[PDB]
Design a protein around this ligand. Structure first.
Ligand SMILES: [Mg+2]
Ligand SMILES: [Mg+2]
Ligand SMILES: [Mg+2]
Ligand SMILES: [Mg+2]
Length: 61
RNA sequence: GAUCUUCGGAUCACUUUGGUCAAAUUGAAACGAUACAGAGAAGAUUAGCAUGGCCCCUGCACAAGGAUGACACUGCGACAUUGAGAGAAA
């Protein structure tokens, strides 16, 4: 019962929008805060950078 | 005005104003009241040092504290294919 003491933990852990024009800008604003913070945490870290642009084109351009 | 001296005529003295309101709700601290939640290190209890800034208070302080003051990410990818089979479009 050695390999079964590990696999039994995984299966136990395994089992365990938007309206208006105004309310979207709130949603859109908070995601900007999110992104800007992750830049301050890491000056360089291009994953956070690249993402941030992609996200803005789809919304605005 | 004062001193010389023809009643003319001299001579001395020369442009202020430290103002964020011209009369205490609506133009210069926030804290406090209340409600919730209620304190790092992979059992539980537990000292700490750092680390990075668009977070800051105490401090004469390039001492030291403030919970170790508080807060803190980790998909992508510069895309090859092989060889076979099926499908739709030229
Ligand atoms: Mg300290
Ligand atoms: Mg402690
Ligand atoms: Mg202490
Ligand atoms: Mg620290």
């Amino acid at each position: 019962x050695x390999x079964x003491x590990x696999x039994x933990x995984x299966x136990x852990x395994x089992x365990x929008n938007i309206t208006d024009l105004e309310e979207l800008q709130e949603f859109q604003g908070r995601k900007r805060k999110e992104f800007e913070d992750a830049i301050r945490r890491n000056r360089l870290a291009m994953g956070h950078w690249m993402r941030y642009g992609q996200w803005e084109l789809d919304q605005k351009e």
